[PDB]
Amino acid sequence: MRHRKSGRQLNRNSSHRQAMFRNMAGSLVRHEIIKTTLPKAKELRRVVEPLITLAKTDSVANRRLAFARTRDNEIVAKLFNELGPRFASRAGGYTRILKCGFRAGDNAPMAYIELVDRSE
Amino acid sequence: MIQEQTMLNVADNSGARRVMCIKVLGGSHRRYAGVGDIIKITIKEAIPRGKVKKGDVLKAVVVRTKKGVRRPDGSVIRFDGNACVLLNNNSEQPIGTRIFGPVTRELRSEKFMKIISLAPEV
Amino acid sequence: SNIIKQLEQEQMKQDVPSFRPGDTVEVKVWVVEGSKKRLQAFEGVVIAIRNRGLHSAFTVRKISNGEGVERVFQTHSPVVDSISVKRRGAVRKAKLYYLRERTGKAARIKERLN
Amino acid sequence: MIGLVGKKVGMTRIFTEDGVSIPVTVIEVEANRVTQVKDLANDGYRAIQVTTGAKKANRVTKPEAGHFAKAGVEAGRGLWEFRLAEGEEFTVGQSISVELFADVKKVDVTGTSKGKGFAGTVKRWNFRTQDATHGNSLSHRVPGSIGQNQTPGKVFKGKKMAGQMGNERVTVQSLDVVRVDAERNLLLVKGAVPGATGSDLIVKPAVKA
Amino acid sequence: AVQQNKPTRSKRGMRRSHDALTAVTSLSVDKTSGEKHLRHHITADGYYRGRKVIAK
RNA sequence: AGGACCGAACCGACUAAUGUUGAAAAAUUAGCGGAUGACUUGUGGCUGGGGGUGAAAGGCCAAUCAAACCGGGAGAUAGCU
RNA sequence: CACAGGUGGUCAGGUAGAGAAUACCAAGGCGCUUGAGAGAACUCGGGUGAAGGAACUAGGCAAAAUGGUGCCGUAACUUC
RNA sequence: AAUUCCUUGUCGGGUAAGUUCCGACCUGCACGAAUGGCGUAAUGAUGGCCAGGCUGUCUCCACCCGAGACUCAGUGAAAUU
RNA sequence: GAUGUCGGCUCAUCACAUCCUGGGGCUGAAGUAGGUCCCAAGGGUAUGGCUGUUCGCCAUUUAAAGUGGUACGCGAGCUGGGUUUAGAACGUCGUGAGACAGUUCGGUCCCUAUCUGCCGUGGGCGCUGGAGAACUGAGGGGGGCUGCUCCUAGUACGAGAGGACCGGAGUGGACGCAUCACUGGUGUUCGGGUUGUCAUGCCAAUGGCACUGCCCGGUAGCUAAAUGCGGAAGAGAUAAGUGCUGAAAGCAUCUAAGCACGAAACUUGCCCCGAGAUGAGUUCUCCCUGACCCUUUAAGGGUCCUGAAGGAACGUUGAAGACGACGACGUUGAUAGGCCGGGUGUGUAAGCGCAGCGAUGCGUUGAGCUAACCGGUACUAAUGAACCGUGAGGCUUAACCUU
């Protein structure tokens, strides 16, 4: 039974899941639009959205917290300088998932995940 | 929570130091003895020139357990170790005269009255 | 849950003093011998606190006749009349179950003067 | 006597002055509305139908709404029936409240138990496991034998096997009613009752007592 | 473990009676580009619910 | 000094689990034994079938051993199926 | 078999370490040619566990446990 | 007794309880002196027994992490009959 | 041209020649406890030591530790200790090879389930217009065990010793159901400590890897060892048995007529499934009230228009779940996530400052972080639609409309 449990295992261990999401978090922040699988995209929301939220209160402790969960200083910078200010007024929902069909190789259901205000 | 093969310390001056529970008395297939429950014991360790001696089979009542008692408010009292007070086989009154260590009010019954009195606590 | 919250806080106590794991505490507890009830004291060290509203609990471990005695108290029970910090203790851990292993000078709590 | 429908809010305790902690399930018993009185003539048995709670006008179907509208009651979340014992009368539109349990001492509660899905024999039927070691080849929690040899030559019916466990109607009987709170629409029942927090409960007085 | 008798052509088809695929019950049409697409999915030209949220 | 001690490479294979249409016609995993010797290993060489070789288990002699393999006698014979 | 096997020699970086052990790394090289989801039973490989502690079992099988350096200390017996 | 049928021999130890174990007894069914007899320190992946410690071995299972099992897509067996 | 053989484990099922519990007659039955037979198979019916054991002895339990059948039930479920391969040895027989219903030590247990069967779970069609709900309950299943203490009463009984039925009250054991409020376990998704090493340029702070590196704690959920509940009472008809009246048979006779007592068995009562109950049932509510062509004119086929109730699909999802299914929600919205606030857990972050040669300590400060929790909030994502499903529902008879 899985009753009231959150957290997709995604046919990985904990270390691999944390690491992929850290990678997927930075790719999103960097590209502002990434194609992944739909279930990965739904979890990605639970990793990426709290960092944008942390990125509104620019304290050095916050840069350190983001660096611990991002391990990239391009991503911390873009969070606290561009994303944090850009989502200053938004009470959550920084990302939007848009389903985009099935992958040719394995028929995985895909989804584009995006920042709600891309402006490119 | 006292079952067969569990070692118990002794809470009396009978002469035994260590005893082993060999039978939880009461019902059939009765798995455990708690505080206030009579058990059958063998003495695995005794002091020389004592009332009891090693290998003697007799009865004991549990007075303290590591699992502990439960109270009606939901409070639990747990002891550091499991201890017993030896009892005669056909009389079930205590062999000793002193009771060493605390006891509980789960022994406040006509049968165990001569233990709560001689105890230093409850 | 607001239902349960309201039903819970309606019987919670108001007098519960602040204490901390490591503090030495004299819990006064009712014992009913027949009909006439008298308070009994259990002085010892707080090794664990559970903070869950009405379901809050705290464990006091004391040594008695060489026999380590732990008592888990339900802090909002009417069985418990009074909690009283007699000594504050400086520990760095929420839970002090390691004090079970220790004895005498090994299980001493340095005093808090914060 | 009839019973009432409610909802599982959760469990709490009631401390008494004497020192006793009483575990209770809190049952939210909103006012039960009679939607249909079945009588011996037209229906063939004497019962009442009730609804309670609320449903969206947008999620009520037209068949449901006419049935509520005929009774002159607001659409609740479901329909439940209670049989009548030959003296108790009721009228459509009549609102029955938790005060009906004011004088009762013990109640039977029924709900849908928590669902455990596909359960093994160990969990579902208290089947003892086999040896964890001492040679055991792939048969640690497996059910063992399921029968005899070329005489029945088949598995008998009702053989305790692995499958769906829970998510079924369960009645727990003779539960002490701790407190009836009419102004707050709550029944307090000593002890656990079936199902998950937030689940429909039916509460009746105890048959046995 | 294994069959004592060859199952027939008929038993084989009865097993496959549930093997038919369901078709798409309906395609949805974009309010702006008129493309057909899977409902709640984006179009092949990059439109979702009339908005062009892809580059291509 | 040592057919000495602990322990890797290296050589082996006591237990257990896995696997038993295997990843594998004998392995894998965890542990286990020897580990300067009667050790181990490479290259090449010699011993040939009632023969070899064997610290001896009828063990091994190209996944084959109480008489190898291939070919021949040969369509042995088969009061049996 | 693009097979968890077998296959001799040579080269031998850094931190820790007695070490060619072990962990992490460098150089260099790989991610093992189906993937995507789900988070049932059961199986496998593992982690933890109240109280009890071999009551298991043919058998403590397996697990758990012990494990290092130095100082002290070390029985029976003995071919010393 | 790696030898004893009778046999779980008798007694004793150890255990609450011991067909095993140890010790002694002799009634050696059916030991016995280099197909060696009796001992024997050390050694043993040797056989049997005991204890300390340890533990999911067990009482009596519970939860968790992973690989499968289940679902989708692709490839696509087998024994049997 | 193979039906795997002892015992164990797991799971069991029937029989009754009944071990306990229940009901009873005789007793050389005072009472307590027994003896023996009759009825009764509802439920229940040990853990250990020794041995491969079945068994048996012994220890200690229990209300009792029943007897048998099921391939001496169960190896395509487990084990492999015994026993029947190859090794080796003792004794013994034999010149010997070898051998023993003698012993010893050691020694590969395969199978992805087609059918039946079983446990679960769905799809299809049917149930005669379609649809959404609520039900009746034919039938089926589950459950059915009992100890101890106290009162009645130290009474009835008995010379004493001891010591009741009947009825009653409480508390346990075992089994089962539910559940998480408590007590706990778990918690590789929370926090913290810490060893070694690498990296983030370095300091400081962090992260990776080392079984989650090792540990200490611990949310939710799941859960037992935790805590609530249950077995019933009662009714009906009976068993063995006890009787009333009562002839046949002037009497007697429980029986022939007739009448009544009488048990955990039976039927009910309690719980669960349940109209595929094709004998397909009932009740409530909802929807559909148009044109016509055709011809073997028949429950006929086709065209146009219409497309409902509702359903499904899709999507967000769930204390529901293998998949289906079930439930909740879909902007007229709290369905999920995010966010806010709280709680919870961890236990006083970082940075700065003070003290100290320094390790570190103190202060800012119960700080910082905080998963699944609570209460809220449309920020994100749950599309305007399309799709399926129709268009008043056979014949015959009867009654009511309307005797």
Ligand SMILES: [Mg+2]
């Ligand atoms: Mg996969």
Ligand SMILES: [Mg+2]
């Ligand atoms: Mg790791």
Ligand SMILES: [Mg+2]
């Ligand atoms: Mg469930």
Ligand SMILES: [Mg+2]
């Ligand atoms: Mg296994």
Ligand SMILES: [Mg+2]
């Ligand atoms: Mg048959």
Ligand SMILES: [Mg+2]
């Ligand atoms: Mg050597």
Ligand SMILES: [Mg+2]
């Ligand atoms: Mg050596």
Ligand SMILES: [Mg+2]
């Ligand atoms: Mg090599």
Ligand SMILES: [Mg+2]
């Ligand atoms: Mg290998």
Ligand SMILES: [Mg+2]
């Ligand atoms: Mg190995």
Ligand SMILES: [Mg+2]
């Ligand atoms: Mg060595």
Ligand SMILES: [Mg+2]
């Ligand atoms: Mg031979």
Ligand SMILES: [Mg+2]
């Ligand atoms: Mg060969």
Ligand SMILES: [Mg+2]
């Ligand atoms: Mg020739």
Ligand SMILES: [Mg+2]
């Ligand atoms: Mg021929």
Ligand SMILES: [Mg+2]
């Ligand atoms: Mg010839």
